[PDB]
Design a protein around this ligand. Structure first.
Ligand SMILES: Nc1ncnc2c1ncn2[C@@H]1O[C@H](COP(=O)(O)OP(=O)(O)O)[C@@H](O)[C@H]1O
Ligand SMILES: Nc1ncnc2c1ncn2[C@@H]1O[C@H](COP(=O)(O)OP(=O)(O)O)[C@@H](O)[C@H]1O
Ligand code: NA
Lengths: 368, 368
């Protein structure tokens, strides 16, 4: 845990060093902007404590030096008493925090603590999302996604099982720009009535003897995107509750009375024709129109021309690489065979079929 | 986004409300602890500003109330000038920050910004890792894991492909309590070239045109765990560079001279016998000794008795529920046939085979 202290006065560099060292941190000090630049380029300090004023340059602007040669460093500026216009200046330049002289040991240490947890708090979801397909129907969806995404209106994705409905949903979230999490709830894979609990969470023992609070998916999706997989499988009790949430923008946990406001973009998916389910009285009509302000239809795999080959090659590579196998080409015979299949399980079926092929691999894959 | 300002003074609650309102927040105020109690049990406030002194009770204690009735609320306490003593008490009771009157509007808004950052910075509490097995060899590994975990010494996990090495590694990370990321590096999937690049990172135009900075996995695993899948597939150059990092505890990126320090717990996995690779001169003794302070041997599926059935029933139940199917039972004949396979692909092979069965699933029983 390193901390670089940049300041003109010993009262700062010494005191702070005595304090930091006393608290488990390993301090270093620079007495000039020159000496500082040296140490920054030489070694990485998670946290840098910088005086707004320095002899050999503008302490504020020096933040740019740090921004340039140590982008991960979290900066705390020290500013003279009363002069906190400089402080804002620094903050807008990208400093994380500032301390006004004079300040106590306690105030210093607390700010340092937060500087380190700011350093320790980075998001790594750099993940790219693979959405393979060149059929005109798929290219049309790919062009539509970015147009739909920057809205907050809900999206209903219709398609057979295993057609990539979740991929499209993540893409939409990605493009929407929303900073919150992508929370997916499977409304079928979950027990009939555990659903209402997954969504709303519980607090104080909602289920038989718990007394331990748990956050619902609604809440976990705050400022993000909630993906409801097979929304058609929701109890008509849950449907009603979910509706009231869409309408009020708040809810309560199971067992609690505390009002909770959420901000979610709702994406739903179904392999049913929900307009037909409404007629059969198996799905609320008002909820349907709420959830389907925008719609996207994903065609079955067998309607996608030669995407079946594209996908096969994509899976064959991904698995052969990952299971250290030496089978990287599909035989022409194999390609013909794939094109003759119905794929009732669609991409999910294809993927599993190719993964199987690789698990039992040889030099090149042919088609039993 | 709601903020509750609990303060005895009218000028305070009015001013701060107006500032919050102007900045986009949704302020609410309470002039007494009684009034604050009412609003808190009824509304969730992501952030609560509380004066250490209140007429009708001790403000610092009121933190416990909040901590009990609104656990996820982040609290900023206001303190009189000099009476920072009392702020320390509040921070110790769980307050997140404190503001010493008098304070500027920027200081206030900067602290509020940070308090919402704190509110929004959360890890996905949901997290279950399934390690299915009741064979005495697997039960022993399960007892070992929690003990091995708490240490920082590296763990080497040996076993055939598909035996659950990555699973055990996450369990160890989990039980270890480390706060950083679990960082997976597949030493095989990656081309011999990207080897050094994935681990260490780079910055400016090292190889063809890479003027864009990239963080190594070493860096990304900071305070967390680095899983080296197939550690034996690392060339002798990297082996040495990696060895150097375990010795010193620091590194530089490629095309970089800045010394960066890491705190990582290393877990490595192999399907070879590295003691033999050393005799073959394929792997360094010294690195091996550093990586093998703790060892775990995962037995092939075929050496696990009836776990093959336990696993087959676990996957069947998982996939049938997930793919909306109703094949939930293994026939006695299926169980017999499973018991007679070699499972060269081990659990990976089994899992895929059962998913296959469920994807093509017809009735409620699987037989072939
Ligand atoms: N167009 C695609 N490109 C690449 N991978 C895909 C594509 N569609 C599906 N997949 C992958 O194949 C499997 C398809 O199942 P899934 O997308 O979950 O189906 P659904 O969400 O429609 O039920 C997933 O593992 C997904 O990662
Ligand atoms: N004992 C187990 N219980 C449940 N799932 C398992 C078990 N062992 C392996 N799996 C699953 O099997 C798949 C392959 O295991 P993996 O850890 O990738 O194998 P390895 O890392 O040994 O090559 C993974 O999806 C994993 O979640
Ligand atoms: Na290996």
């Amino acid at each position: 845990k390193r901390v670089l202290v940049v300041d003109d006065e010993e009262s700062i560099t010494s005191s702070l060093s005595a304090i930091l060292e006393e608290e488990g941190y390993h301090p270093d000090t620079a007495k000039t902007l020159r000496e500082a630049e040296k140490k920054i380029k030489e070694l990485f300090f998670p946290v840098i404590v910088l005086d707004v004023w320095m002899p050999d340059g503008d302490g504020v602007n020096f933040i740019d030096f740090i921004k340039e040669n140590s982008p991960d460093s979290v900066v705390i500026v020290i500013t003279g008493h009363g002069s906190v216009d400089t402080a804002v200046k620094a903050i807008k330049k990208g400093a994380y925090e500032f301390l006004e002289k004079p300040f106590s040991v306690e105030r210093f240490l607390l700010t340092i603590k937060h500087a380190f947890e700011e350093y320790s708090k980075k998001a790594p979801p750099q993940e790219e999302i693979e959405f393979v397909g060149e059929h005109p129907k798929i290219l049309e969806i790919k062009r539509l996604i970015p147009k739909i995404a920057k809205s907050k209106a809900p999206v209903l994705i219709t398609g057979e099982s295993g057609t990539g409905k979740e991929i499209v949903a993540r893409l939409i979230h990605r493009y929407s720009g929303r900073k919150g999490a992508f929370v997916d709830l499977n409304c079928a894979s979950i027990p009939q009535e555990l659903a209402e609990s997954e969504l709303f969470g519980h607090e104080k023992g909602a289920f038989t003897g718990a007394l331990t609070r748990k956050k619902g998916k609604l809440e976990l999706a705050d400022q993000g995107t909630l993906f409801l997989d097979e929304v058609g499988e929701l109890d008509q009790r849950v449907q009603a509750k979910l509706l009231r949430v869409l309408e009020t923008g708040s809810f309560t946990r199971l067992g609690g009375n505390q009002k909770i406001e959420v901000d979610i973009r709702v994406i739903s998916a179904t392999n049913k024709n929900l307009e037909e389910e409404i007629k059969k009285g198996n799905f609320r009509e008002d909820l349907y129109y709420r959830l389907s302000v925008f719609q996207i239809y994903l065609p079955p795999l067998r309607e996608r021309g030669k995407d079946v080959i594209l996908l096969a090659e994509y899976f064959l590579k991904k698995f052969a690489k990952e299971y250290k196998k030496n089978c990287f080409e599909l035989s022409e015979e194999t390609k013909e065979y794939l094109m003759k299949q119905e794929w009732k399980g669609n991409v999910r079926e294809l993927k599993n079929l190719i993964e199987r092929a690789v698990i039992l691999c040889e030099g090149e894959v042919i088609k039993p």
